[PDB]
Scaffold this active site. Sequence first.
Site, mmCIF file in Angstrom:
data_model
loop_
_atom_site.group_PDB
_atom_site.id
_atom_site.type_symbol
_atom_site.label_atom_id
_atom_site.label_comp_id
_atom_site.label_asym_id
_atom_site.label_seq_id
_atom_site.Cartn_x
_atom_site.Cartn_y
_atom_site.Cartn_z
ATOM 1 N N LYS A 64 0.824 -1.185 0.000
ATOM 2 C CA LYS A 64 0.000 0.000 0.000
ATOM 3 C C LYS A 64 0.867 1.247 0.000
ATOM 4 O O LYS A 64 0.650 2.116 -0.829
ATOM 5 C CB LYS A 64 -1.240 -0.088 0.921
ATOM 6 N N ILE A 98 -26.493 5.568 17.116
ATOM 7 C CA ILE A 98 -26.090 4.807 15.949
ATOM 8 C C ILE A 98 -24.562 4.586 16.003
ATOM 9 O O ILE A 98 -23.722 5.490 16.193
ATOM 10 C CB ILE A 98 -26.570 5.482 14.644
ATOM 11 N N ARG A 141 -21.089 23.160 17.989
ATOM 12 C CA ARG A 141 -20.169 23.469 19.072
ATOM 13 C C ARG A 141 -20.835 24.283 20.145
ATOM 14 O O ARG A 141 -21.889 24.856 19.902
ATOM 15 C CB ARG A 141 -19.053 24.282 18.484
ATOM 16 N N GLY A 181 -17.682 20.874 23.076
ATOM 17 C CA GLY A 181 -18.659 19.997 22.393
ATOM 18 C C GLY A 181 -19.897 19.597 23.236
ATOM 19 O O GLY A 181 -21.017 19.337 22.774
ATOM 20 N N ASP A 182 -19.694 19.553 24.511
ATOM 21 C CA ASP A 182 -20.779 19.194 25.341
ATOM 22 C C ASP A 182 -20.376 19.466 26.751
ATOM 23 O O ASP A 182 -19.191 19.620 27.022
ATOM 24 C CB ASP A 182 -21.045 17.705 25.134
ATOM 25 N N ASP A 248 -23.800 15.703 30.426
ATOM 26 C CA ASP A 248 -23.610 14.450 31.208
ATOM 27 C C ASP A 248 -23.196 14.743 32.651
ATOM 28 O O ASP A 248 -22.184 15.342 32.902
ATOM 29 C CB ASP A 248 -22.423 13.579 30.711
HETATM 30 CA CA LIG Z 1 -22.862 7.958 16.517
HETATM 31 CA CA LIG Z 2 -17.618 14.959 27.115
#
Ligand SMILES: [Ca+2]
Ligand SMILES: [Ca+2]
EC number: 2.7.7.7
Length: 327
Positions: A64, A98, A141, A181-182, A248
């Site tokens: 490769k 998912i 974001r 992000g969270d 969370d």
């Molecule tokens: Ca996902």
């Molecule tokens: Ca996190």
Amino acid sequence: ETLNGGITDMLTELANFEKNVSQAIHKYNAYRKAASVIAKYPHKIKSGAEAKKLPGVGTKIAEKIDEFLATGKLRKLEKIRQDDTSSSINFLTRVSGIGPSAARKFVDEGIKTLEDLRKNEDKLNHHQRIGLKYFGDFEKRIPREEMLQMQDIVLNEVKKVDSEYIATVCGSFRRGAESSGDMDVLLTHPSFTSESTKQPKLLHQVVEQLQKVHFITDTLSKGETKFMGVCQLPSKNDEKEYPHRRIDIRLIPKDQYYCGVLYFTGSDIFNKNMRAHALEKGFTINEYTIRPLGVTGVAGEPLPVDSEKDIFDYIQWKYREPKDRSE
DNA sequence: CATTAGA
DNA sequence: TCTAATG
Ligand SMILES: [Ca+2]
Ligand SMILES: [Ca+2]
Ligand SMILES: [Ca+2]
């Protein structure tokens, strides 16, 4: 870091695919060690052969590397990148809930699109339902400017329910980060640690709080120690509502905070590095504690921690403000 | 690397 | 119970 760059990224693309589009756990694991080793090599790979002298570097990959070296591409790469099904999987994946398993399953059923997904929301679990519902927003974001407003509310209820609570918003946020992000909330209480066998309600009380007032808007997952949700900032005096944000919250034995706090606050490298040092300094650092090393090879015995400081002091280092915990 | 859903 | 998905 850059001399080896295409090889590595090619290799990674190579890996990512086997793992998701195929179930090639090994091939996958294969490309990654390679992609790893070839990354450490201090010289320019000039040929497969050269590479080949590497560990994890086999005939397969070497082959490769030549192709890519020779021509600035790779067919298999070019073909995959092209492949609609394979594409399909990659995409479905972005849906929170998912994963590969399901991506594949979905495809095989003919659901390859966002709309596909909608049309058959029945085919989907609550998690994925929600994910589906907040697709845009979830990908978006979180401006600090908002992180700030959110952390605020959060601290407020925390406090209103029980004043004895301790919350911390860990992550890049906690490390300055223009955006996140969270949100990561670490939770603890004196009345919960190591042995004091729970108080699930401890987690419970506050989730209920957050909802009660409308910060919490959905539940992705709720357990006795780790809550995973969706939240939103009161859409003002109209004309501007807030995007749906993942959040969370997590219960922690009061006797395990700071290490965890230290830890979740990163950065990934700061960690690794601090950790590496605790080894010389005769210690062991991990997500929950800090143990003194015993020459026999290893050792136990959790040193007591009341602050991010103790852990520092322990390993006789310079207290690093989170701001500069970057590496 | 541990916690949760779910089937 | 196992298996998947998140972090
Ligand atoms: Ca996902
Ligand atoms: Ca996190
Ligand atoms: Ca070899």
